[PDB]
């Protein structure tokens, strides 16, 4: 029986604790079991003897992952759909400094989150910045673009060039 687990920070516990009933329900339509350990502080999903397509566990592995990094449930469970893809991009190991990482991340989201939104509208993806991760959700190509933009942004490459390039690409597709 296949099984995947993930750890979640304490400040998320509460939220998960009140939405978990939905989670299992959403998982129950695939006969996938799930357990919220409040001692270990972890979420775990696993297959059963009644799982029709075991492959879906991979999707179920993504779900809780997204849940662990503050992705809202109604947005998170879309991963169970066949077409949806996801990508958790770690951004903590690009900068040795502390408050430089803050600067560059800030530049990734930008003023009023605008640039982020722009990114979201050009790659056609959901994006959420949280702590040392950037959780992305959508089409594979768009996810590749998001990963390029984010990773380059953490290496002190300004996202304006990427946004302009994506803009031109969007305009060429008409």
């Amino acid at each position: 029986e296949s099984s995947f687990m993930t750890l979640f920070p304490k400040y998320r516990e509460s939220y998960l604790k009140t939405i978990w009933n939905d989670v299992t329900r959403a998982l129950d339509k695939h006969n996938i079991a799930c357990v919220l350990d409040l001692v270990e502080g972890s979420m775990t999903v696993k297959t059963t003897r009644k799982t029709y397509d075991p492959a879906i566990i991979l999707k179920a592995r993504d779900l809780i992952k997204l849940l662990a990094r503050s992705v809202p449930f109604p947005q998170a469970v879309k991963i169970l759909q066949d077409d949806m893809a996801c990508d958790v991009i770690k951004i903590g190991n690009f900068v040795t400094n502390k408050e430089r990482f803050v600067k560059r991340r800030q530049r990734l989201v930008g003023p009023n989150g605008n640039t982020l939104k722009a990114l979201e509208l050009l790659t056609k993806c959901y994006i959420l910045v949280q702590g040392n991760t950037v959780s992305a959700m959508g089409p594979f190509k768009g996810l590749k673009e998001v990963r390029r933009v984010v990773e380059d942004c953490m290496k002190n490459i300004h996202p304006i060039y990427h946004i302009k390039e994506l803009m031109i690409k969007r305009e060429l597709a008409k």
């Binding site: 530049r107 930008g110 605008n114 640039t115 002190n156 300004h158 304006i160 946004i163 803009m167």
Partner: peptide, 20 residues
């Protein structure tokens, strides 16, 4: 030095303003 990034922030801001 870091006037490049500060310039690009304003530039990106205005560009986003002038596109939507």
């Amino acid at each position: 030095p870091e006037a490049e990034n500060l310039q690009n922030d304003l530039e990106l801001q205005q560009f986003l303003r002038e596109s939507h």
